[PDB]
């Protein structure tokens, strides 16, 4: 494989991204940005496009390397070793199954509706 | 005082116990942070050290299940910035009208599973429709829910 | 602390909760074999959900029915389990509020007061009459109550927070009577659902699927001609049930007790009779302020049909409004817990020292 | 918890070879002496169980439990719900099972032996 | 009207107490930022004074030791040091 | 009652103006605090770095000169850009 070619291939699964960066060391490091911004309601932290590096938002972007993963937001940085990122993605998969976590914004909001109406009457 | 249901406790229990198979009954504050951001909230180092100061006078690095549950309950308890309120309404409305039709509510109810009656649903609509237009705008939803 | 002998569904909460922390079914079990069969028999007592789960080794009754505490020991068992398991507390830290049906004989009233005081550690305590605080949940001081689905079916006219004892009467139908008629009409239709499991499934059916016809003759002719008005239900066994005229025939028994074979005027006409018993000045307020309560009222259509039927009975000068709290199968508990919340109510209680000389007399008096 | 449970097992293991009755008599006796010695035996075993055995096992297990810190096993529970959630409650309920089982064996072995002892006279 | 006037009286007395709380809180903010700038001024003058000592190596050694003992605390800087070492790995390899 | 109503509505509106003003002033103080505290970070981290720097007196002198110059008036990523 070759680096710009794999960029243009436009695969987006973090598992496959990790596999690709592990497999093809000569293709170097890759930065990635999310298939919708955080502003979306269907936003996902773990669905992302991998892009030519200038295109990313300067203020919020993710980065990975076969050595390490790293993230930056608003000049705040955290450094990660890839197995941490992978297992945190696995956690997110299973945590996302969790019925309340899958629904929590509904759970709390509609509960507040119930409370407010009955408390008021 | 904040509370959540026994079934919510059961779910949180499965969360805790899957978070590490090591069966310790205590797990890393770092993993609590991973949990919160998996919920969708990434709190900052000031909040990290604040919660650590709650959990671990001794500095095990670990919540027990009761700490994990209680901090979860508290972070669940408070009011959100407008973005999350918009997310809530956007999930409540998939007519994409900006209106919670009774249909929209009824589907949300069937989704969450609580069997509350049709008159009860229509009554919380009616009070939530703070302008009495026929159902609740995202404006009317804001107006009631911010109170 | 709040305590309800709710005879369709009993309930408990701390005072000023938003809902009863505990809700539990109106039963206590005894071992059905006289010997302890196996170490599960650590007690001879199985209150509430214990009986519901364990029926087959257990002796099964609604301990109360209709107007009275029937079986004082078994009720004391229920209350003891309510405090220690359901309220999960030793109560004496906080005042306790308790329910009784209207026109409970004063002998029972004092007997209960004594039983609660001597058997349970307590600071101060009161038993309240379900209609009166049920009306408090309406917010009126001045109103007539109806209740059905948690007890026998009462009418109670209330002026400025108190009844006209002159004007209290029952209609001798309870939640079972609805299940009985529905079982009859299901067996006519051919389902023959009557077994204790079938009995519970039919109670679920009657609770959710009942509706009250706006004009029964018309609605019945409509559904029998137009089966599009009869609606499908899935049984736990995967059968589909169709329910139609049964949806409103069952509540119609309240309007035509002869449907369940009862030789009585309907709920509407017995309410009208109760109103007529009182002062016409109160009567106008009762027509202005009717409150209906209990699981049977929870249904759709009941309050509209009742509004129409009372308007048909009521003089044309009377304004008619059925007041239908969405919660009304809890009305008493809501009113009681709210009232008990008030620290100014704390002076109303009766406590140990006055309880000695005053207490037998003073509770009997404050119970009105 | 191993040390605690093995300790209570030892307590049962002397308990299981106690007796609830004096299934032994040297020679003939008159009635009142039977009543005295049996009622004494019952009182002795009742004090032994209620004061001695329960207190002994309770303080011994507590002493072992004492220094298990935060976790499921926390002696210092503060919520009935979480206790019911905990392994700790389930362990305790197993202790309840074991000590009931053992006293059941003691009851059976006392009653059977005593009856057989009468049997060898009456048969 | 009478109910409206009374409600406005209760509102305005509440809003007065809220005003007074806000005024005292912003007073605390202002004195806090005054103290923060006084700290910054003390830093600046310390730097200018150790620059004045700089002309003698022993005097600079004592100034660096004194300002070290006064200012430093391990703070986040130990964590910053570790994560900077890791980021330095990333930087060096991607630079290469 | 009309005159009293107008008085009380005016005075409440005036106090809501007071609270809006005090909010704006709190936002100005928030700006001041933010900038001062970030400068406290900058100075203390530079001090920690000059302490960590090579305490060879020539090197320490040069580091002091660097701080003096920059105060009298994240990088590598920007260079990678």
Swiss-Prot record, chain B:
| Ranges of residues in domain EF-hand | 7-42, 43-78, 80-115, 116-147
Q: Which GO terms describe its cellular component?
A: 9+2 motile cilium; apical part of cell; centriole; centrosome; ciliary basal body; cilium; cytoplasm; glial cell projection
Q: Does the keyword Endoplasmic reticulum apply?
A: no
Quote any Pfam family the record assigns: EF-hand_7
**InterPro entries for this protein:** Centrin_CML-like, EF-hand-dom_pair, EF_Hand_1_Ca_BS, EF_hand_dom, RNA-helicase_DEAD-box_CS
GO biological processes:
cell division; centriole replication; mRNA transport; nucleotide-excision repair; protein transport; regulation of cytokinesis; spermatogenesis
Going by the UniProt record, its keywords in alphabetical order are: Acetylation, Calcium, Cell cycle, Cell division, Cytoplasm, Cytoskeleton, DNA damage, DNA repair, Isopeptide bond, Metal-binding, Mitosis, mRNA transport, Nuclear pore complex, Nucleus, Phosphoprotein, Protein transport, Repeat, Translocation, Transport, Ubl conjugation
Keyword Ubl conjugation listed? The answer is yes
Superkingdom, according to UniProt? Eukaryota
As annotated, the Glycyl lysine isopeptide (Lys-Gly) (interchain with G-Cter in SUMO2) covalent link is placed at 1
Q: Which SUPFAM superfamilies match?
A: EF-hand (SSF47473)
Q: Which GO terms describe its molecular function?
A: calcium ion binding; G-protein beta/gamma-subunit complex binding; heterotrimeric G-protein binding; microtubule binding
- For binding Ca(2+) 2, which residues are annotated in this chain's numbering? 129, 131, 133, 135, 140
Residues annotated with Phosphothreonine modification: 5
Q: Spell out the note in the miscellaneous section.
A: Binds two moles of calcium per mole of protein.
The entry sums up its family as follows:
Belongs to the centrin family.
Q: Output this protein's name.
A: Centrin-2
**What is the organism field in this record?**
Mus musculus
User: What gene makes this protein?
Assistant: Cetn2
Curated annotation (Swiss-Prot), chain D:
The listed locations are: Cytoplasm, Cytoskeleton, Cilium axoneme; Cell projection, Cilium, Flagellum
Q: What happens when the gene is disrupted?
A: Mice are viable and show no malformations; however, homozygous males are infertile, due to inability of spermatozoa to move from the uterus into the oviduct. Spermatozoa show decreased motility. In addition, tracheal beating frequency is reduced.
**Taxonomically, which superkingdom?**
Eukaryota
State the family it belongs to. Belongs to the dynein heavy chain family.
The record's subunit annotation is: Consists of at least two heavy chains and a number of intermediate and light chains.
What does this protein do, in the record's words? Force generating protein of cilia required for sperm flagellum motility. Produces force towards the minus ends of microtubules. Dynein has ATPase activity; the force-producing power stroke is thought to occur on release of ADP. Required in spermatozoa for the formation of the inner dynein arms and biogenesis of the axoneme.
Q: What is this protein called?
A: Dynein axonemal heavy chain 1
Identify the species of origin: Mus musculus
Designated gene of the protein:
Dnah1
Q: Which residues of the full protein are shown?
A: 494 to 616 of 4250
Swiss-Prot record, chain E:
Q: In which tissues is it expressed?
A: Predominanly expressed in testis, lung and skin. Weak expression in brain and kidney.
Q: Where in the cell is it found?
A: Cytoplasm, Cytoskeleton, Cilium axoneme
Can you state the subunit structure given in the record? Answer: May form homodimers. Associates with components of the nexin-dynein regulatory complex (N-DRC) and the CFAP184:CFAP263 complex.
What's this chain's function? Associates with components of the nexin-dynein regulatory complex (N-DRC), a key regulator of ciliary/flagellar motility, and might act as an inner dynein arm (IDA) hub or linkage.
Family per similarity comment: Belongs to the CFAP57 family.
**What name appears for this protein in its UniProt entry?**
Cilia- and flagella-associated protein 57
Species assigned in the record: Mus musculus (Mouse)
Upper classification of the organism: Eukaryota, Metazoa, Chordata, Craniata, Vertebrata
Q: Which residues of the full protein are shown?
A: 1010 to 1105 of 1249
Curated annotation (Swiss-Prot), chain F:
Q: Which tissues does the record link to its expression?
A: Predominanly expressed in testis, lung and skin. Weak expression in brain and kidney.
Q: Which domain of life is it from?
A: Eukaryota
Q: Where located? A: Cytoplasm, Cytoskeleton, Cilium axoneme
Per the UniProt entry, the disulfide pairs are: none
Assembly with partners or alone: May form homodimers. Associates with components of the nexin-dynein regulatory complex (N-DRC) and the CFAP184:CFAP263 complex.
Q: What does this protein do?
A: Associates with components of the nexin-dynein regulatory complex (N-DRC), a key regulator of ciliary/flagellar motility, and might act as an inner dynein arm (IDA) hub or linkage.
Which protein family is named in the record?
A: Belongs to the CFAP57 family.
Q: What is this protein called?
A: Cilia- and flagella-associated protein 57
The organism is Mus musculus (Mouse)
Q: In the record, what lineage is assigned to the organism producing the protein?
A: Eukaryota, Metazoa, Chordata, Craniata, Vertebrata
**Parent-record interval covered:** 1010 to 1105 of 1249
